[PDB]
């Protein structure tokens, strides 16, 4: 569960980095709260074009 950010956020905030977050942190808060999204190897290209 690496995911890519969206806004700032915690000791990793950056509007679009590849972090390595704990899954529960990921699929219970950030994504449902729209602060990140999974890095599904398709996603590692849209925020790897900027």
């Amino acid at each position: 569960m690496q995911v890519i950010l969206l806004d700032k956020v915690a000791n990793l905030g950056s509007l679009g980095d590849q972090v390595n977050v704990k899954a529960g942190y990921a699929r219970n808060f950030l994504v449902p709260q729209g602060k990140a999204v999974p890095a599904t190897k398709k996603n590692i290209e849209f925020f790897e074009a900027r």
Binding site: M1, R27, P32
Partner: protein
């Protein structure tokens, strides 16, 4: 029933075995939980009775796919 809506995991029967190998019937049943999942693609939460792994699948494949299944298969949800 204790069936994982994602994997179809259900209880399975096996044995106990003592140090003397006495067999006593028993069941392994799955690590169910039931969990509010955000879809966004429907602006709603859906509670699936899900196994861990069921979760780990949802993590990987991603919810909507999994929801294509279930619906593809007829699961209520």
């Amino acid at each position: 029933s204790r069936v994982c809506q994602v994997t179809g995991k259900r209880p399975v029967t096996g044995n106990n075995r003592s140090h003397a190998l006495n067999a006593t019937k028993r069941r392994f049943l799955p690590n169910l939980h039931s969990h509010r999942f955000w879809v966004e693609s429907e602006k709603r939460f859906v509670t699936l009775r899900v196994s861990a792994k069921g979760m780990r699948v949802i993590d990987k494949k991603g919810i909507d796919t999994v929801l294509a299944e279930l619906r593809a298969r007829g699961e209520k949800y």
